[PDB]
Design a protein around this nucleic acid. Structure first.
Length: 1536
RNA sequence: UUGAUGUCACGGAACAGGAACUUGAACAACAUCGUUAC
RNA sequence: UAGUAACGAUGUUGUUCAAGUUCCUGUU
């Protein structure tokens, strides 16, 4: 007796979902079951397990149908078809149930009796209301009834908000689930109607089902009828198998960046030679073990797997791989909800019968990168994320649009709302308009990943970043189009005036929707607006509206968009939007950098930092453009304001801004109110291609490149020819331009920015940034009227340089050395506190110094961007893999000769820090030294005893003595009778050892005429002689010693005098003879066939090392000559090398072995013997500490990395040939010990000795790098206060020097008429320095000398011709020297030095270090160990700064500064200023007719035509061991 | 998997504050091998 | 029982980033 009607709803927007709770907190007393009643619910079967499906109750649809029926019944004056309708009853006497009452002011029509219950025929509204069921409403569920695994598998919980209006920051908040509508767009159910309900109630029900449009926070229309985890584990295991475990976070941040495209893995950078050993992209490979994959190979084979071919799959793989790597690198409260008021009776009111409808279509594009915070969980790498769609599309929610309409409607009026989330609806002017507004979501169809930005926070006391202030941020691209649709229904004749004014504001590009609006985030603009007003008051238009469900669906919208008239309606009352745009145009004069290291790690150029580049969208694809961040510009202007204004004593950079109305707190805002000025990004107006500059860090002692300290950067190029314009804008509020107190502050700050201070960008300490001018427009001269400069234009001249007094006595026919260290003092002061990079102090100076550099000796500053600049034309370009002859040019920026700022910074820093006797800025406190020990028995080789380590690596057992066993000879055979188990020393052998051999001579007492002078004939006694056999040269004898106790057989070689005693031998005569003993320490295997004497059989260990001591050469040495032809070839394996020739041929002395390889090398090999350790003394061992093992490790590392070694791997020793690492267990060593503790372990007889301490502990404790903690503390060296350090910014900025006259090169070029290119000159070898010649020994006597200042001379006239400086031979090219292009003497440059917050004695010392006396000169450039690079600097106008208006050129104050600097220098050191005298002696320039000839020695004396006693004779006599330091300190000592 | 005579949740902007920055001459002379003889 | 004496040859590149901070303050 029923009739089922099947309905089905279909969503057009993401609906919302509530949270599940058990059936105990489901009363009217819970505050989360209420406020969760207007959403969809989540049912789970088998309670306590999150598994179920969503559903919508029937009571909610009943309430929506009731509300639509009330809204529809007053539109036809209460008559459905024929009969009038009763007003209905909404009163209930019981209120313990009915968990929620109605607070709505029910509509009215035809007020009459409420049709009491004791009736028999009701009003159709009472049949719809339900007065066994009359109209039963059923549950709506999913079509197929599936089962998901929880509420997080269909949706995502996001946080909503509730912001304030005056202090526009926040209030409480809440959160809810939202499910996307592209995955779950359909729900189904039915409605059970009785038979005898009516024939007019069904029409009302159908019209009410068609008139309802939203159910759960969304529009609707109701109708009726495993790789990434294992790859992460593999990469982590690779990083842990090696020692590169500190590159894990950079690897994570660089791998997450590859999610943009898969064509970036085949374009990762390489090394500088084009190899495949990058420092992070090639971790894992070794010298051996080819089956070792790297990270580049892992990313390459994972780029083509037929699973990661799509973009979404590759993006997801990159994201979760980066997340896993970040998580692996890691481990090394206020919310309101509800409270609705339970009102007893609703105040029923009438609204009338006039109802219209307005549709506004169009679209709104983005003009700046927008931001919508959707920071979710389970993703902790970015910590500031954006809102995305489940298919990675950008969207703007309707909550943000609704809140922004609310804010603009409150701003159009001048009265905020005062609602408190409860009770009767609010009835102000801005809540009667907001109750008829309906908007929609967007999708933007872009589908591209967002870029990541890095931000920091700077401590304004030191200048560096604060502790713990570093975070990321991701922003959406610029230029995305969102579809827009607004709909309003009310009683007016169209739109109101407030909405028309707000839409006219939005049509001018002033719709600041959401984001970090203070730093120039999303600003949209509504375009292509259409509108059309319907009329639901009549009946011929309402039925056509109800026939097609309005026009909400896609077909209805495509039919509606053909009826809308174009152009928005003009408002009746305009309001002049409250934001004003001001343009900004900056022009620079130097390079510019805005760091980005991750892009440098992914980029294929192979640099360390690259400039910042943002993307922009063109509809489906993104293109990059270089720009300047908005946060950096905002920070610059904020710091420029904060350092001038006082506000009651303490400046604005020291306040806490807790509850203060400071001047920064009222313009730039704080954590309690929003700001009133919004900046924006700055584009560069052109296409500047980045260039590459190389840098290095020159050590102080042994001035050369320090270890691990070579780097580069890729900034944008700018020069006084092409000035790198910058364009942008920023927005200010309307009620700030009208104030006269804030505009003055902004004008003062921009006037300080314009006058040269506050450089923009990165490394401004070497001449980057340097704003030349700044000009704003668009403000009617309210701010740009205080930005006018004002100088003095005086005529005071600059005082001339004083005359020098330190002179040297240089004579002819003598040579000099070029090093001459400068020994320092012993008192470096660190008892002063640094100033602080805050407000400009009162008694300190700030300004500019303009200098003038003029060269007087050829200068070389190379342009290391390319080699082969002097390459011949019209030939082959270059072979792939070879070592050619490098040749460079001079430095150019835009085809203009320049000198960088870091060169001058380093030079002046060295001179300034050696004047004030300050801390060694950069130093190498590692790398302990080592020396080869000499070959003399008494001094060194006496203490090294033979030994052997025990079964465990803890003790060394010593031996008694040694004897040498002959190998590689022709008089025995020891290789084919001993196996490999006994020649490696792991098994004892048994040899026969002889100690003393016996010579023979016939006449002892009557031998004084000929012999008996050698004094060795003092142990002869007597002896009888026999004869048993005849030989060719020798004769047999059987001699007794004193009484016939023993007899020995020997072979005696007679001589002239012996010949006569020989003459007759009948085998039986008794000759007279004498026996003498001589030393013979040999040990053979069996027995030799020449001495059948008593050999003492002993027991010991044997060990071999291989054929060492090769005198290889290239010029047919004295032993290869006078040979017997046909030299053999090199054998491919040892144990077969024999003796070829003898060194002495009269006697049978030392044997050699001459061979010849495929090249022109000629080897001559000594060492025809090996050593045998016998007589192992037990029960006496010595322990090995850790210092011995560290010394042994350094010894092995030196042995294995040697470029001067023998090219053949057969003639090396065992230590270097087999490449071993640690001390094994059971190997022979030569150790040194004293009282149970060993000191040194060497492998061979004559090896090298490593010193115990490092080189950092051979100085004083005060001269070490003045770095560390010992606001900032007071422990800083006097040179780390002018120039910076880590955790303290320096207050001196240098600048790019530029040439102004004509070049005037050294040698003319190849093309006449083009005076802008020079000719090439070829240099000498230029080999790296040796610190093992200044520190000769290692005990305690040799400390570290000074700072290695090179002397001035003229030795470039010999290189100009083509000879060598030491000899006179012509130099020949090779793949080890360069061919540079140089300038000549008589060129002029000009640069500028900016300083701030200096004292009056630091400026005097800086001027004394810039300009020297009138007889000295500086030295910069390349190859200044010859005569190359000699400059002098003259100082021009020194214009100071005293206020933000006037600058007061102070040329007339220099001598007071110089006197104060000298007075401070006298105060520190009383009368011990000898280091300044030495430094003035070392900077002396030969004024005239003096030609000091300096050069380095040669190796020996026989290889230079002058014969000047090279290094191998200078180690004895002059520079022996104790005069080295002394003779290298005196500024001009004769080279001898 | 809801209750019926009463749901303005299209009744609520994840908003407000923060300088990828600090320090650094692209430079530079004496070492490397071990034993041989009595 | 036991150790004493210092000699012979002339050739060759190296570093290519390092030390720091890598997240906080708050809504009623």
């Amino acid at each position: 007796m029923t009739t089922t009607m099947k309905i089905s709803i279909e969503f057009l927007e993401p609906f919302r979902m509530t949270k599940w709770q058990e059936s105990t907190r489901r009363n009217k007393n819970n505050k989360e079951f209420v406020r969760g009643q207007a959403f969809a619910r989540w049912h789970r079967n088998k309670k306590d397990n999150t598994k179920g499906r969503p559903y919508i109750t029937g009571t909610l649809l009943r309430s929506a149908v009731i509300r639509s029926a009330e809204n529809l019944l007053t539109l036809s004056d209460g008559k459905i078809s024929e009969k009038t309708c009763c007003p209905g009853k909404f009163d209930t006497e019981d209120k313990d149930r009915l968990l929620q009452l109605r607070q709505r002011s029910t509509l009215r029509w035809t007020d009459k009796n409420p049709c009491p219950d004791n009736a028999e025929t009701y009003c159709p509204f009472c049949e719809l209301l339900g007065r066994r069921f009359r109209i039963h409403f059923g549950n709506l569920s999913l079509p197929g009834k599936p089962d998901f695994d929880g509420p997080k598998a269909i949706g995502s919980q996001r946080v909503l908000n509730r912001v304030d209006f005056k202090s526009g920051k926040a209030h409480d908040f809440f959160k809810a689930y939202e499910v996307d509508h592209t995955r779950f767009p359909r729900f189904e159910g039915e409605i059970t109607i009785d038979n005898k309900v009516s024939a007019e109630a069904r029409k009302l029900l159908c019209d009410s089902l068609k008139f309802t449009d939203r159910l759960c926070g969304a529009l609707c229309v109701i109708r009726f009828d495993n790789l990434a985890e294992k790859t992460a584990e593999q990469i982590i295991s690779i990083l842990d198998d090696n020692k590169k475990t500190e590159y894990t976070r950079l690897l994570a941040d660089a791998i997450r960046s590859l999610r943009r495209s898969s064509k970036l893995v085949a374009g990762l950078p390489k090394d500088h030679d084009g190899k495949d050993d990058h420092y992070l992209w090639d971790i894992g490979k070794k010298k051996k073990d080819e089956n070792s994959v790297t990270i580049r190979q892992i990313l390459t084979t994972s780029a083509d797997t037929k699973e990661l071919k799509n973009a979404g799959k590759w993006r997801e793989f990159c994201e979760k791989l980066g997340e896993a790597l970040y998580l692996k690198s890691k481990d090394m409260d206020a919310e309101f909800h509800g409270k609705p008021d339970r009102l007893e009776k609703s105040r029923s009111v009438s609204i009338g019968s006039v109802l219209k409808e307005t549709v506004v279509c169009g679209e709104l594009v983005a003009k700046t990168p927008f931001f919508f915070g959707a920071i979710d969980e389970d993703a902790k790498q970015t910590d500031l994320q954006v809102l995305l769609t489940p298919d990675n599309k950008y969207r703007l929610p309707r909550s943000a649009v609704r809140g922004i309409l609310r804010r603009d409607l409150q701003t159009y009026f001048d009265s905020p709302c005062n609602a408190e989330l409860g009770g009767r609806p609010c009835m102000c002017k801005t809540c009667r308009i907001m109750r008829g507004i309906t908007v929609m979501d967007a999708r933007s169809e872009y589908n591209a990943p967002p870029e990541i930005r890095h931000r920091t926070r700077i401590n304004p006391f030191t200048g560096t970043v604060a502790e713990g202030a570093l975070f990321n941020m991701e922003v959406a691209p610029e230029g995305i189009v969102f579809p827009f649709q607004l709909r309003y229904r009310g009683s007016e004749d169209g739109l109101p005036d407030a909405l028309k004014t707000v839409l006219k504001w939005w049509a001018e590009g002033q719709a600041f929707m959401s984001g970090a609006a203070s730093t120039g985030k999303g600003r949209f603009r509504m375009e292509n607006a259409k509108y059309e007003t319907l009329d639901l008051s009549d009946e011929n238009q309402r039925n056509d509206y109800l026939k097609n469900w309005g026009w909400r669906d896609e077909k209805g919208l495509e039919e509606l968009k053909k009826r809308l008239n174009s152009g928005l309606p003009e408002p009746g009352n305009y309001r002049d939007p409250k934001w004003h745009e001001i343009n900004v145009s900056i022009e620079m004069a130097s390079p510019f950098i805005n760091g980005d290291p991750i892009r440098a790690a992914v980029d294929k150029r192979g640099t360390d930092v690259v400039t910042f580049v943002k993307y922009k969208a063109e509809g489906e694809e993104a293109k990059p453009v270089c720009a300047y961040k908005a946060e950096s510009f905002r920070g610059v202007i904020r710091s420029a304001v904060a350092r001038i204004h006082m506000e009651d004593g303490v400046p604005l950079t020291e306040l806490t801004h807790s509850d203060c109305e400071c001047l920064l707190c009222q313009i730039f805002g704080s954590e309690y109110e929003a700001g009133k000025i919004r900046f924006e990004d700055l584009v560069f107006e052109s296409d500047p291609e980045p260039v590459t500059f190389d840098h290095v860090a020159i050590d102080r002692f042994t001035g050369g490149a320090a270890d691990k300290k070579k780097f580069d950067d890729s900034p944008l190029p700018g020069s006084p020819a092409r000035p790198l314009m910058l364009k942008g804008s920023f927005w200010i509020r309307r009620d700030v331009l009208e104030d006269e107190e804030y505009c003055k502050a902004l004008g003062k700050a921009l006037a300080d920015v314009n006058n040269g201070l506050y450089p923009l960008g990165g490394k401004s300490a070497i001449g980057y940034g340097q704003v030349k001018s700044l000009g704003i427009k668009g403000d009617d001269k309210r701010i740009s009227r205080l930005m006018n400069p004002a100088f003095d234009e005086t005529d005071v001249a600059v005082p001339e340089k004083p005359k020098t007094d330190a002179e040297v006595r240089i004579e002819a026919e003598k040579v000099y050395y070029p090093h001459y260290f400068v020994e320092p003092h012993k008192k470096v002061e660190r008892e002063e506190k640094p100033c602080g990079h805050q407000k400009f102090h009162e008694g300190r100076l700030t300004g500019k110094i303009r200098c003038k550099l003029i060269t007087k000796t050829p200068l070389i500053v190379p342009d290391t961007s390319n080699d082969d600049f002097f390459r011949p034309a019209d030939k082959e370009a270059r072979k792939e893999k070879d070592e050619y002859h490098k040749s460079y040019a001079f430095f150019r920026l835009h085809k203009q000769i320049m000198i960088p700022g870091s060169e001058l910074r380093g030079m002046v820093s060295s001179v300034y820090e050696t004047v004030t006797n300050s801390c060694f800025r950069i130093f190498d406190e590692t790398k302990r030294l080592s020396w080869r020990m000499d070959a003399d028995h008494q001094n060194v080789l006496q203490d090294f005893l033979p030994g052997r380590v025990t079964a465990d690596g803890k003790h060394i057992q010593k031996f008694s003595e040694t004897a040498r066993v002959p190998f590689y000879d022709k008089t025995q055979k020891h290789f084919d009778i001993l196996d490999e188990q006994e020649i490696a020393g792991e098994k004892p052998v048994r040899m026969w050892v002889k100690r003393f051999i016996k010579r023979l001579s016939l006449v002892d007492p009557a031998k004084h005429p000929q012999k008996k002078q050698d004094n060795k004939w003092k142990r002869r006694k007597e002896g009888i002689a026999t004869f048993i056999e005849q030989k060719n040269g020798s004769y047999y004898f059987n001699v007794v010693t004193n009484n016939g106790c023993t007899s020995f057989h020997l072979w005696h070689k007679p001589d002239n005098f012996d010949q006569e005693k020989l003459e007759g031998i009948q085998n039986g005569e008794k000759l007279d003879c004498w026996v003498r003993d001589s030393r013979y320490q040999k040990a053979f295997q069996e027995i030799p066939e020449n001495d059948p004497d008593g050999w003492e059989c002993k027991e010991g260990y044997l060990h071999v090392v291989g054929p060492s001591k090769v005198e290889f050469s290239d010029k047919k040495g004295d032993v290869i000559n006078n040979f017997q032809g046909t030299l053999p070839s090199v054998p491919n394996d040892w144990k077969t090398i024999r003796t070829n020739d003898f060194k002495n041929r009269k006697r049978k002395n030392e044997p050699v072995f001459c061979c010849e390889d495929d090249k022109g090398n000629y080897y001559t090999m000594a060492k025809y013997c090996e050593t045998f350790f016998f007589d192992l003394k037990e029960n006496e061992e010595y322990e090995i500490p850790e210092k011995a093992r560290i010394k042994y490790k350094e010894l092995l590392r030196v042995y294995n990395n040697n470029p001067q070694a023998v090219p053949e791997s057969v003639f090396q020793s065992r230590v270097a040939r087999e490449n071993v690492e640690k001390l094994k267990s059971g190997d022979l060593v030569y150790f040194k010990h004293n009282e149970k503790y060993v000191e040194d372990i060497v492998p061979v007889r004559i090896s090298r000795t490593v010193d115990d301490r490092m080189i950092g502990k051979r100085m004083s404790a005060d001269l070490r790098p003045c770095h560390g903690d010992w606001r900032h503390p007071k422990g800083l060296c006097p040179a780390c206060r002018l120039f910076g350090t880590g955790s303290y910014k320096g207050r001196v900025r240098f600048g790019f020097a530029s040439l102004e006259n004509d070049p005037e090169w050294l040698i003319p070029g190849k093309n006449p008429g083009d005076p802008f290119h020079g000719g090439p000159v070829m240099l000498s070898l230029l080999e790296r320095p040796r610190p093992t010649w200044s520190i000769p020994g290692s005990d305690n006597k040799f400390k570290v000398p000074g700072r290695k200042f090179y002397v001035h001379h003229h030795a470039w006239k010999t290189i100009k011709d083509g000879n060598h400086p030491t000899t006179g031979k012509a130099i020949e090219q090779s793949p080890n020297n360069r061919t540079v292009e140089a300038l000549a003497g008589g060129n002029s440059f000009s640069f500028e030095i900016a300083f701030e917050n200096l004292k009056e004695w630091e400026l005097g010392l800086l001027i004394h270090s810039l300009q020297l006396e009138k007889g000295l000169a500086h030295k910069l450039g390349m190859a200044k160990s010859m005569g190359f690079g000699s400059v002098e600097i003259d100082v021009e106008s020194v214009r100071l700064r005293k206020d933000w208006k006037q600058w007061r050129n102070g040329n007339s104050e220099i001598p007071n500064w110089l006197g104060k600097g000298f007075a401070k220098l006298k105060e520190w050191f009383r009368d011990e200023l000898d280091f300044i005298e030495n430094l003035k002696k070392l900077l002396w320039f030969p004024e005239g007719d003096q030609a000091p000839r300096v050069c380095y020695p040669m190796l020996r004396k026989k290889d230079d035509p002058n014969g000047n006693s090279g290094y191998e004779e200078l180690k004895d006599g002059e520079f022996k061991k104790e005069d080295r330091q002394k003779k290298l300190t005196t500024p001009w000592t004769p080279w001898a």
